Amino acid sequence: HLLNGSMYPSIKNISTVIYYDGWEVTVGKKTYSYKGVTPGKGYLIRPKR
Amino acid sequence: FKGQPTPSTITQITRAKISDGKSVRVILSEGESTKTQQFYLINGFFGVAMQDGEKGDEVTLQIEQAEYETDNIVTSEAFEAGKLIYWDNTAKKFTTTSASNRLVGRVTDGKDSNNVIWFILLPQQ
């Protein structure tokens, strides 16, 4: 939205965004965790090259 | 489950046995290295390093306590059938001198012409 009446345009060429939150499981006594994307941080990725 | 509509509690069903225990993985220090299908004493575990580790990699020592064909003997010592067999890690060779050397098995077939001995592998005592 036009913050202070300053029309900011939509970013383009970003075909899709993805959301990889963390995963976890406590199998037996040991805890095994697949780390997710940190909050805030992100990764702009070039696809399948 | 995150964001579930209602609270819940979970209970863990403990079970001690986790793996068959036939093969243990160890990590190789600076002076250690492994070739495929050869006996190595690493981190107090003796057995067949089933892969090549060089250094830093983790390698599979297979400790099924079966009969193994190993040679690599100190040929000066005569390995009679039935003798207890020790690993000398300083020389990285089998022996029967014992002393401070680790015990690793008991010989089934004695020292033949090719210095080839078949021996049963003792547990990781």
């Binding site: 090259r49 | 495929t36 299908q37 089933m50 892969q51 090549d52």
Partner: protein
């Protein structure tokens, strides 16, 4: 019988090349709109 025994003998193991883009960028003549060219072997 471990597969590690046959690791070193690369000839026995099937060989497949990891397809990837290898090469170097093509250079281009940027100057040409700026400059006006006069060609004469006798200069």
């Amino acid at each position: 019988m471990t597969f590690s025994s046959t690791s070193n003998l690369k000839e026995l193991l099937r060989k497949v090349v990891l397809d990837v883009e290898l090469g170097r960028e093509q250079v281009q003549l940027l100057y040409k709109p700026i400059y006006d060219s006069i060609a004469d072997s006798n200069l």
